[PDB]
């Protein structure tokens, strides 16, 4: 800490999130933020992103938590290093609030 | 740390805050930000929000600190887990400053 | 940590900052951000602000560091509690950069 | 921690970043953020910036990581004190994402 | 044209807008913008605003058009002069769009 | 002029725009803004939007001008009234510029 | 129309505006925007600005309208050409609204 | 009016602007906005931009007015159609103001 940190800021993707008739019939915007630690050539982050986009847009999700976890797993699938954190914002998910997000991390 | 963190970003509510004639006669805008830890189906955050909105709009407050605490308590009332942090911004409360906020946390 | 934290966000003040002919002849904008810890009625933050504004606008400064320190001291002058942090932004102080800031803290 | 922290916020520079025909033929925007610790007259940060700008604009880079490191080194070249952190954002480097950044730090 | 123009920018009010179960059970945010012409002491705009706020918050609306018209009328009720324009934004009323607004004007 | 104006602000849609290998293989973000005049119940703008979204997402475009025109036509297809203007932004289409847009209008 | 138009965007000045005890004891922020037409060497706009700043900061105002007019006059005092428009925003002058402004123009 | 309008929004370029020692030794940021009318395949706007960028970055300017005119001329050099408007912002050119711009148009 700190050392080698790569950040993917505000990756905006559209997919199905929710179970409600409208949520299942229409795609919505969700915002992904990725923090990857890998101390200390590198075609990496591009592939990780590619995979996360592909997985997110080509699927249906019932719960931000499942989506976040799936992404997190995708992030540790290829490298073994070192620490990964994923926050997923569902913009305007609550009345009167700008967003609601779920963050998950791993070693 | 980090693990399971849910964030409720910029929940904008209107209520009475202050003792001043104008503050008691007219509602004002206040901005709430909630950080909840709950390692590691979940109809939870929706209910918590519902309760915090309902409590905030349906009452009168004399001091940001009382409001923040009341919210914090509301956040730990239902689950026992795990860590909760509440920041409340009173926008343009001071001359020349964008905001003033009070943050409180608990185990 | 975390517990009782009060934040004063983007207090914009105008004063003389610098030694350069233009800096001494003309006031400039500077942005102050204050973090105060005081675990766990309170006419406090209003007075602190009052004093910091009054001190900043009614003086001349040769160096962000002196200004920041003076504010920090003003913050610990009245209460003994508990932790205080002061960041001062000199907007557009460097070519091509949004700002330059100095942060100082105390126990 | 915290103590003496100087921040250089959003230093926007244009240079060549990448190997792709377009990346080598045309300069791009990159955003640098510098955090310097130096507890506890000072013509310093101005010179550091000067050197980082000069080095960045007067060169070609094949990889954000090389650019970030080069800057970091430039930051510790003159003083011995104390801690330095450099984040470099390549705006709109990924499709659908606001930015991608690399952060590096040192003692 | 141009001459005497007063603008009330982004008046944010909460009221009931819509017929849908959720729209009738819960208040929503709406943003009002007023342009008043009165060529060429004046306690006016304050009263107009007062009346528009009071009318908007103390009622229920079935359609942006009715709300906008009601405001417009309120604007010409007191003075006879000279030209008035009212835009009402229903933020995030459409999927994927920042807002939808209705503008109405009068002589 | 002015009278009855409805505005659809920043309708963000993703579709294929361009002929370039990357433009044809990957969808991009485009921002639509609609101005409709209809002097002086109304399930209208919702349907218009529905149709414009459906047409935009379910097709491929070779040129902003074709896309803009197609939308404009969709806007006059249902009502006969009265004036319609459509601006389409292709964000970050040019190096160093925030956007490029095409606007078209009709009677 | 259009031809030679110079714009001075968001000139932020602090002065006394109002009659209320607080308004007379404390300076406030006001935002000035100037549009000057002069079809078709020029040390002009710098001097105009200089004079408007000097006049605004070195005086007390009872009413946005007086302030706006005084500025407008200052703008036509030196050149005879050609058209001038002045908007003055009093930020957060009304509850729930971002600003209130007064615009005045001349030949 | 309105009909075929293409807009190039916030083209940010760096060049030498001014006569002052610092202005001649160091490049600065300037923001260009182009409005082109051409009622009613088109490799046009790309070339126009290319030429305006190339001309702006590969030269030195003594006065926003000369720069704006040079761009305007570049815009009418290739097509004969139809109306062109060019605004050039010199960000933070005046103390306390966000920008100063010069606009010029032609038939």
Author numbering:
A (entry chain A), B (entry chain A), C (entry chain A), D (entry chain A), E (entry chain A), F (entry chain A), ...: 6 to 45, 56 to 122
Published text:
FolX encodes an epimerase that forms one step of the tetrahydrofolate biosynthetic pathway, which is of interest as it is an established target for important drugs. FolX has been shown to act as an epimerase in conjunction with FolM, a reductase, during the conversion of dihydroneopterin triphosphate to tetrahydrobiopterin. Therefore, FolX and FolM are essential for tetrahydromonapterin synthesis in species such as Escherichia coli and Pseudomonas aeruginosa. Here we report the crystal structure of FolX from the bacterial opportunistic pathogen Pseudomonas aeruginosa, as well as a detailed analysis of the protein in solution, using analytical ultracentrifugation (AUC) and small-angle X-ray scattering (SAXS).
FolX crystallised in space group I432, with a single chain in the asymmetric unit. The monomeric structure of FolX comprised a four-stranded antiparallel sheet, composed of β1 (residues 10–12 and 16–20), β2 (residues 33–42), β3 (residues 98–106) and β4 (residues 114–121). The structure is not complete, as only residues 6–46 and 55–122 can be observed in the electron density. This disordered region exhibits the greatest sequence disparity compared with E. coli FolX although it is located opposite to the active site and is therefore unlikely to affect overall function. Most of these residues are disordered and not present in the electron density, implying that the active site of P. aeruginosa FolX is flexible in the absence of substrate, or exhibits multiple conformations. The interfaces between the subunits are made up by strands β4 on one subunit and β1 on the next in the circle. Analysis of the interface between the tetrameric rings, using PDBePISA, indicates that there are 16 hydrogen bonds and 8 salt bridges connecting the two tetramers, which may suggest that this interaction is significant despite the relatively small interface area. The infinite dilution sedimentation coefficient (s20,w0) of FolX, derived from the concentration dependence of s20,w, determined by fitting the data with a non-interacting discrete species model, is 6.09 ± 0.03 S. This corresponds with the value of s20,w0 computed (using SOMO) for the octamer crystal structure (5.97 S) and not with that computed for the tetramer (3.62 S). The octamer crystal structure fits well into the envelope confirming that this is the true solution oligomeric state. The active site of FolX is predicted to comprise residues from two adjacent subunits, which suggests that the tetramer is essential for the activity of the enzyme.
